[PDB]
Design a protein around this ligand. Structure first.
Ligand code: BCL
Ligand code: BCL
Ligand code: BCL
Ligand code: BPH
Ligand code: BPH
Ligand code: HEC
Ligand code: HEC
Ligand code: HEC
Ligand code: A1EFU
Ligand code: A1EFU
Ligand code: A1EFU
Ligand code: A1EFU
Ligand code: FE
Lengths: 52, 274, 44, 325, 103, 51, 256, 51, 51, 44, 51, 50, 51
């Protein structure tokens, strides 16, 4: 691997960014975290599949 | 007594502490340094329960109830007949459970096998620990632990569950319950394959791993394999124990309102039109 | 002639005499203990 | 540390395994379309093999989709075909059972009539799937343990929605088709009939539910502990006992004084799981038909604990004291 | 006086409800048909509305119990009873359970 | 009589352990039962006579 | 019905007692089904013990083994018993550990003890040997993870004993079972097998911690380089797991 | 009579354990039934006699 | 008497461990039982006599 | 000549002498400890 | 008449164990049924007779 | 008649145990039902005659 | 008197480690028991004596 795990790491890092980014513009932690979790699975999953 | 094959496995060594001072067998049981402590703590806790039952006035196993102290006593010690006996038994219970897990380490070390069993038991201990000491510490009183009674500790579950107005809406309860109903489903199906393959209809040859492997491929379109089922079966059970610890440690230390009110984040998202 | 434990007839006979001696001694102390308790608080 | 067999460190993939075959000609109903997933292969088999489609499988899938659609499309109509509102309230919507005023008669479509029609298709779909399990075992010349275990689950499924409503003489006793609503029914069911904690069969079913998770954690870890001796090949250990079965047995014998065999463990495993809905099915059947109040039943039979302390908060603190003022 | 003077002399004034508003907050109306295509017990029960307290419990609990004198108790008062028709069912219990998350 | 033949049926080691456990649990149970009553609870009587 | 038969014994109470009777029979059945192997009990000296337990032995059941291997009635004499065990009692009584009389890893006692299984390879549904090297297997290859072929093997004390030459797979289940080790001349002579559960695969090496460098020359060998019998599998695996306690005195002696 | 042939059917060392447990469990259960009744409860009777 | 024969059937280093647990269990249990009583609690009696 | 533990008759006779000496010394301290407690707070 | 042939079909060991357990449980059930009734309860009848 | 041929189909061992269990459970169930009824409860009826 | 033979049956190094652990846990337990009370809590007494 060493690339699928790395791409997964970018996804979880983006989810943390998405959570705090949405909290800055309002929203709430749980509302922001849900989109952060959702962004982790989609973007992280796509990156691991689009490029290996 | 021994078994037909037990003699060649009873070799000296493998202890974590105490060496050959305690390294012997009493009947079928293995006694170690932690087998001595297990015997002491379990017997002390058992006797104290019946001592408390004697002072409670009843020896009926359904009606025996040793209860924690009041919330006023805080994290300090309480009088023995006013909730202090429960605290002593908890120390004995924790000491007996930890010793039991450490005794399992010595046994599996003497047999040259893995430490999966003691590790899995630790999750069960962690669920017990988070119910009796971890959660009361966060909530600031020893009276938040469940009482030591066969039917009394169901009343604690009933009131703790209804202390949040609907305990089915707990997101961690939702996840944790899903793991029991699935682990039992996995246990039923896994135990059926081995039984079905090893016990075919009378007059038929027994089936090998290939036959059971292709059964679920024919049945649900995918088979996890002989190794995978145990590997995923432990994970389902361990996750069940872990998530059950989560659902009760966030009820009161992290969340004080009703559990249906938690889902208000989903209902009132900005994306949803008004 | 019959013994599931491997003990001989004489070995069990010797063992029983010692065991019964302990049984009577344990019962003798119990009788004295019970007799003292009856004087303290009779239950009949 | 030592390698714990939780993730495979290397995967090998060859030609797809199409499965064994006999004179029953299993291959003519097989899809023969296979795919390999490496992500799932880290923990289990990596092949998504062909599925046997017969008639019980097809009938169950078609009728099951009809139940799914009828329940689902009713929910969409309930929010006025508003997709954003359908997604938002997805966990809250349901297809409520008929009102109690209609008894066992057929209610109007908007008041539980579609519930009965949808429940009819779900009953067909579940029974057809059971027949497929029974038929597949017979065609594979294997034991019918899968069908018997699944029949135990259906027993609670039948009691909860079919047998008990008939005994009470009202279709209103069924379970609503909703995510949160069948949790609401579960809580309301316990409250209406006393306290379901004091149902002896509910207590007994919990014993076998906890035992099921207990035993599969014990069995899952034990096999992983002896997988260094080829312990994952359970079937071959039954026919020719190796050192894996001996150590696994001796570990539990030295721990708790008795053990099992590689075959006998799966008899314990089968029976605890099967007894979980069998005992619960009896408890639900007796609830409402016989007892109607479980805590009062417990008080009558003298296993309800009694408390001597006071009940109000004024007996333990004050309103000002709690508020810190 | 048995309620507003329960423990101490608290009492109720015009500020108790209004709190500085022309119309008091937490006033409720009758949203009875929360569902379009359904009628009966199914038309008040399967939505997360303002009166349902974030649950799928009935939304007419306030209307039936706090305005219409409906019976709130649902339990059976002895160990075994004969279930005659008209007795409370789990639906009535669930409506009571809806009112009581509001309490 | 011939009661000594029981040791040809039962192993002396396992019987001695069996009754050693049984006798103590017997002694513990009866002692606890007396403590549960009011008339034979010698701990409460000592407090009562102290007055 | 809401009417009690006598006192307070209703239909719900009757069903509870029926389950109690059924459960007692179920426990009796379940326990006796677990006594098909290992009984009678015997003692430390090898003679049958005076105590055999409250549960009598079950009736005989027959397994119709496939591939023309005959029948098998589990309750009976065990063909997996080992003879001439290199052990001696440390006490004149019962319940005390045995001490090996020689090299425990070589003699196969304790953690290193094997079982006398059949001396034939395990077979798949077709009848061919179940475990074969990937050289013989057609169409098989590594699809994920780290390929260990060619990586050096590092023992439990850090010594390099050789490089992985081949790797044996279970083509029926597409699962790796063993890794072949090409022993260096300074450590061994030929090839040895290590099961996949005692090896940790790294990016540049494979590490086995249960066996030191000097213990590799005594790993049991296979009769043929194309298949491994059940007995050879049981001897090879037991040797590695026996090194988790017998590699050095520090492992045998208490850690505290 | 000819009842001695029961030991040709039942293994002696397993029946004795069975009746040893049964006899004690019988004795304890009958002793506990008497305690439940207030007429034959010798513990509560002794308190009444002392008054 | 001839009670010394008990060591002809019980190993000394398996019985001494047995009573070592048993003796300390008694010492711990009886001390804890007294501490629960209101009359023999020497820890709270010192507070009481301190007035 | 029954001996389950392998100890000879003289071996156990000398071992029991030491055990009983420890038993009496342990009992002697318990008697003194009990006597002092009874004077402190009698329980009879 | 010719009922002795039942032992050619039933294993005497299996039947006797089942019959022994069945006979006691049946006896216990009938004895307990009498205790529930207010007319045949000999424990409660002696109390009324004593008064 | 010619009903003896039923034993060519049914195993006497399996039928006899099933019949024995069925016969007792039926008899116990009927004895219990009578006890529930007020007219046929001979225990309560004996009290009335006293 | 003649207790030196206890080391003939118990390993000196194994006993010393075991009784070192026992002595400390016993010492810590009794210290904590004193801290639980109010009379023998030397930490709270210092605050009480200092006004
Ligand atoms: C209620 C009034 C008194 C009271 C009344 C009594 C009375 C009366 C008695 C005691 C007894 C004892 N009490 Mg007190 N006791 C009270 C309060 C206390 C307090 C306290 C902090 O308050 C303490 C610490 C104790 C402690 C003790 C012990 C000294 C002793 C119990 C021995 C036992 O249980 O284990 C013993 C079990 C063991 C096996 C432990 C051995 C463990 C060690 C490590 C083994 C090492 C062996 C090793 C191989 C070396 C061997 C060498 C040999 C020379 C061969 N009591 C109150 C204040 N207590 C009883 C006693 O024993 O007196 C002698 C006694 O008769
Ligand atoms: C307030 C809540 C009440 C409560 C009310 C109930 C009620 C009501 C019930 C239980 C019952 C159960 N309770 Mg309870 N229970 C409570 C407290 C608890 C607690 C706890 C820690 O407090 C626990 C652990 C339990 C545990 C349990 C289990 C023992 C048992 C469920 C059996 C089972 O496995 O179902 C598994 C069975 C099913 C899920 C049916 C399977 C359906 C069929 C076979 C599958 C159809 C599939 C379908 C078509 C969808 C397929 C789609 C696929 C995608 C293709 N209860 C409290 C007191 N409990 C049940 C019982 O009584 O059993 C006697 C039950 O009915
Ligand atoms: C209610 C009025 C009296 C009362 C009335 C009675 C009466 C009456 C009796 C007792 C009896 C006993 N009481 Mg009391 N008893 C009371 C309060 C107490 C108190 C207390 C702190 O208050 C204590 C400690 C006791 C303690 C005891 C024991 C001395 C004894 C029960 C032995 C038994 O059960 O197990 C027995 C234990 C075993 C069999 C196992 C022993 C384990 C040892 C370690 C095994 C070593 C074996 C090894 C091989 C060495 C063997 C060497 C041999 C020399 C061969 N009583 C009150 C005060 N008590 C009964 C008794 O036994 O009298 C003799 C008795 O008859
Ligand atoms: C992964 C989580 C699951 C799990 C796993 C698990 N449990 C385990 C193991 C594993 C892997 C073992 O290896 C170990 C074992 O060896 O089992 C046979 C064990 C075990 N889990 C057990 C029970 C158990 N497991 C439960 C559940 C679960 N454990 C989960 C479902 C439950 C529940 C929730 O109902 C119970 C009751 C035991 C059979 C065994 C542990 C045995 C043990 O600790 O023995 C030492 C102690 C004694 C002999 C007696 C101690 C007495 C105390 C000192 C006093 C009383 C304290 C207690 C709080 C009493 C409370 C009573 C009231 C609540 C009624
Ligand atoms: C009691 C012990 C455990 C248990 C046992 C158990 N369950 C079992 C079995 C056993 C032994 C089986 O053999 C059987 C099985 O097949 O397992 C794989 C099963 C089973 N129990 C299941 C689940 C299940 N188990 C549960 C619980 C349990 N049962 C316990 C954990 C529960 C709960 C919590 O109640 C559930 C829900 C199923 C997965 C399975 C058999 C159900 C089944 O397949 O029914 C036939 C139905 C269908 C094929 C279709 C159903 C509906 C679909 C969702 C429709 C398709 C939708 C799709 C998107 C199409 C859309 C089309 C439109 C867009 C046009
Ligand atoms: C006009 C406002 C009013 C309304 C409407 C009202 N209450 Fe009250 N309630 C009060 C007042 C004022 C008090 C304070 C009495 C005191 O504690 O001395 C009180 C006190 C209470 C108490 C006592 C609390 C205590 O600490 O003992 C309870 C419980 C209660 N109310 C519940 C309810 C419920 C349930 C309802 C809905 C049916 C309700 N109340 C409706 C005014 C009202
Ligand atoms: C327990 C609460 C309660 C109390 C006491 C209360 N009211 Fe009201 N009042 C209401 C409710 C309910 C309404 C109707 C809702 C609305 O109109 O918004 C209302 C409506 C009114 C309105 C009309 C609002 C409109 O929309 O114009 C006025 C004016 C009024 N109240 C005056 C008073 C005065 C003055 C007092 C002080 C004596 C008082 N109320 C005390 C509950 C109460
Ligand atoms: C302030 C105290 C209060 C709170 C909060 C409360 N209850 Fe109640 N509850 C009552 C009162 C008052 C009644 C009586 C209504 C009746 O009998 O008319 C009642 C009745 C009920 C009933 C009917 C019982 C019977 O008589 O049949 C149930 C069900 C119920 N409550 C459950 C709950 C649940 C579940 C909760 C937790 C959400 C809850 N209650 C919270 C006050 C309360
Ligand atoms: C619940 O109820 C309530 C009322 C609360 C309750 O409490 C109930 C109380 C109950 C039931 C009391 C039960 C207690 C009983 C029955 C008392 C057993 C106690 C006994 C028996 C005392 C043994 C003492 C043995 C020693 C201390 C030996 C010392 C050994 C020394 C050290 C010698 C060994 C040394 C050697 C060197 C050996 C020589 C070696 C060679 C020659 C090699
Ligand atoms: C719930 O109900 C309520 C009413 C509450 C209740 O209480 C119910 C009470 C009920 C039911 C009473 C149940 C008690 C019964 C039935 C009493 C059994 C008790 C018996 C039988 C006493 C054995 C004593 C044996 C000893 C103590 C031997 C001593 C052995 C010595 C030490 C000899 C060993 C020495 C050797 C040297 C070895 C031998 C020789 C060689 C090896 C050569
Ligand atoms: C529910 O409530 C209501 C309705 C009110 C209710 O209560 C219903 C009641 C109902 C339904 C009553 C059901 C009772 C029935 C059906 C009665 C069966 C009872 C029977 C059948 C009695 C057998 C006794 C056999 C013995 C006692 C043998 C002893 C044998 C002895 C020990 C000799 C040993 C044997 C040997 C062979 C020696 C060995 C020889 C050689 C080896 C040569
Ligand atoms: C995008 O796609 C479209 C398609 C548009 C869509 O909408 C997607 C669909 C969506 C989202 C629906 C999501 C479904 C949901 C949430 C349903 C959850 C379901 C749940 C929780 C089940 C509760 C337990 C049910 C029991 C326990 C039954 C027991 C009753 C059985 C069946 C017995 C038979 C009953 C009878 C009455 C017999 C009648 C027969 C005759 C009368 C002969
Ligand atoms: Fe398995």
């Amino acid at each position: 691997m060493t690339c699928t795990i790395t791409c997964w790491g970018i996804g979880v890092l983006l989810g943390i960014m998405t959570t705090v980014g949405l909290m800055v513009v309002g929203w709430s932690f749980l509302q922001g975290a849900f989109m952060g979790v959702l962004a982790w699975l989609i973007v992280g999953g796509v990156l691991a599949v689009a490029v290996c | 007594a021994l078994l037909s094959f037990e003699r060649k496995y009873r070799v000296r060594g493998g202890t974590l502490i105490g060496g050959d001072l305690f390294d012997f067998w009493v009947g079928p049981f293995y006694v170690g340094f932690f087998g001595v402590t297990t015997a002491f703590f379990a017997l002390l806790g058992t006797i104290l329960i019946f001592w408390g039952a004697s002072q409670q006035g009843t020896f009926n196993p359904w009606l025996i109830n040793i209860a924690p102290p009041d919330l006023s006593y805080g994290l300090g010690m309480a009088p023995l007949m006013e909730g202090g006996l429960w605290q002593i038994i908890t120390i004995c219970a924790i000491g007996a459970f930890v010793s039991w897990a450490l005794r399992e380490v010595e046994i599996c070390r003497k047999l040259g096998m893995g430490y999966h069993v003691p590790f899995a038991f630790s999750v069960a201990i962690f669920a017990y620990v988070t119910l009796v000491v971890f959660r009361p510490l966060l909530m600031g009183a020893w009276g938040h632990g469940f009482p030591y009674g066969i039917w009394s500790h169901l009343d604690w579950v009933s009131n703790t569950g209804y202390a949040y107005l609907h305990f089915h809406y707990n997101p961690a309860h939702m996840i944790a319950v899903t793991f029991f109903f699935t682990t039992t489903l996995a246990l039923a199906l896994h135990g059926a394959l081995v039984l079905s393959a090893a016990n075919p209809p009378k007059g038929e040859e027994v089936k090998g791993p290939d036959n059971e492997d292709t059964f679920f491929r024919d049945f649900i379109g995918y088979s996890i394999g002989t190794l995978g089922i145990h590997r995923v079966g432990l994970l389902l059970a361990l996750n069940a124990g872990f998530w059950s610890a989560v659902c009760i440690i966030i009820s009161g230390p992290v969340w004080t309102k009703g559990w249906p009110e938690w889902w208000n984040w989903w209902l009132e998202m900005p994306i949803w039109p008004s | 002639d019959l013994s599931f434990t491997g003990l001989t007839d004489e070995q069990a006979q010797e063992l029983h005499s010692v065991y019964m001696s302990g049984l009577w001694l344990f019962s003798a102390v119990a009788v004295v203990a019970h007799l003292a308790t009856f004087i303290w608080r009779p239950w009949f | 540390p030592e390698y714990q067999n939780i993730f495979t460190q290397v995967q090998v993939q060859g030609p797809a395994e199409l499965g064994v075959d006999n004179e029953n000609n299993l291959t003519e109903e097989r899809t023969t379309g296979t795919g390999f997933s490496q992500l799932i292969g880290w923990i289990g088999n990596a092949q998504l093999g062909p599925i046997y489609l017969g008639w019980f499988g097809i009938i169950s899938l078609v009728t099951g989709t009809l139940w799914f659609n009828i329940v689902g499309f009713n929910m969409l109509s309930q929010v006025g075909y508003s997709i954003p509102e359908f997604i938002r309230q997805l966990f809250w919507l349901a297809l409520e059972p008929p009102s109690p005023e209609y008894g066992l008669r057929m209610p109007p479509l908007d008041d539980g009539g579609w519930f009965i029609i949808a429940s009819f298709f779900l009953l067909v779909s579940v029974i057809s799937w059971w027949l497929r399990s029974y038929q597949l075992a017979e065609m594979h010349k294997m034991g019918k343990h899968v069908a018997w275990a699944f029949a135990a689950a259906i027993w609670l499924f039948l009691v909860l929605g079919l047998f008990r409503p008939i005994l009470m003489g009202s279709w209103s006793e069924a379970v609503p088709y909703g995510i949160f609503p069948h949790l609401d029914w579960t809580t309301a069911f316990s409250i209406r009939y006393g306290n379901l904690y004091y149902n002896p069969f509910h207590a007994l079913s919990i014993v076998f539910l906890y035992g099921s998770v207990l035993l599969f954690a014990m069995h899952g870890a034990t096999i992983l502990a002896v997988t260094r001796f080829g312990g994952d090949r359970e079937l071959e250990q039954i026919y020719d006992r190796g050192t894996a079965s001996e150590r696994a047995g001796l570990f539990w014998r030295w721990t708790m004084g008795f053990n099992a065999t590689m075959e006998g463990i799966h008899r314990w495993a089968w029976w605890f799981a099967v007894l979980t809905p069998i005992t619960g099915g009896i408890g639900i059947l007796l609830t409402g038909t016989v007892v109607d109040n479980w805590f009062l039943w417990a008080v009558e039979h003298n296993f309800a604990p009694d408390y001597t302390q006071d009940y109000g908060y004024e007996a333990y603190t004050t309103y000002d004291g709690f508020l810190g003022r | 006086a048995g309620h507003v003077y329960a423990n101490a002399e608290v009492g109720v004034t015009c500020f108790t409800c209004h709190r500085g508003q022309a119309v008091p907050s937490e006033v409720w109306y009758r949203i009875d048909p929360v569902t379009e295509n359904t009628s009966g017990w199914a038309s008040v029960q399967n939505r997360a509305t303002s009166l349902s307290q974030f649950t799928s419990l009935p939304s007419d609990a306030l209307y039936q119990y706090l305005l219409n004198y409906e019976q709130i108790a649902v339990h059976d008062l002895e160990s075994r009873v004969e279930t005659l028709p008209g007795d409370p069912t789990w639906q009535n219990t669930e409506r009571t359970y809806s009112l009581m998350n509001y309490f | 009589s011939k009661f000594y033949k029981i040791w040809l049926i039962f192993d002396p080691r396992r019987v001695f352990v069996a009754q050693g456990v049984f006798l103590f649990l017997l002694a513990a149970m009866i002692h606890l039962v007396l403590l549960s009553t009011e008339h034979f609870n010698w701990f409460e009587l000592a407090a009562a006579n102290a007055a | 019905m809401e009417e009690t038969f006598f006192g307070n014994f209703d239909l719900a109470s009757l069903s509870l007692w029926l389950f109690y009777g059924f459960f007692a029979l179920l426990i009796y059945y379940l326990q006796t089904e677990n006594m098909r192997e290992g009984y009678p009990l015997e003692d430390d000296d090898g003679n049958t013990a005076a105590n055999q337990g409250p549960f009598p032995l079950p009736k005989e059941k027959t397994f119709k083994l496939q591939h023309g291997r005959g029948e098998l009635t589990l309750p009976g004499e065990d063909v997996q018993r080992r003879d001439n065990l290199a052990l001696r009692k440390t006490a004149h009584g019962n319940g005390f550990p045995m001490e090996p009389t020689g090299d425990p890893m070589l003699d196969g006692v304790g953690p290193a003890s094997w079982s006398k299984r059949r001396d034939v390879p395990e077979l798949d549904a077709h009848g061919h040997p179940k475990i074969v090297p990937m050289s013989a297997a057609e169409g098989f290859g590594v699809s994920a993870g780290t390929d260990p072929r060619g990586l050096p093997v590092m023992a439990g004390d850090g010594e390099i004993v050789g490089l992985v030459s081949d790797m044996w797979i279970d083509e029926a289940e597409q699962l790796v079972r063993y890794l072949e080790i090409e022993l260096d001349p300074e450590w061994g002579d030929g090839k040895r097998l290590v099961q996949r559960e005692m090896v940790r695969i790294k990016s540049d090496r494979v590490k086995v911690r249960s066996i030191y460098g000097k213990h590799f020359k005594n790993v049991p060998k296979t009769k043929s380089p194309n298949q491994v019998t059940l007995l050879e599998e049981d001897k090879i695996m037991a040797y590695y797991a026996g090194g988790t306690l017998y590699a050095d005195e520090s492992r045998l002696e208490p850690q505290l």
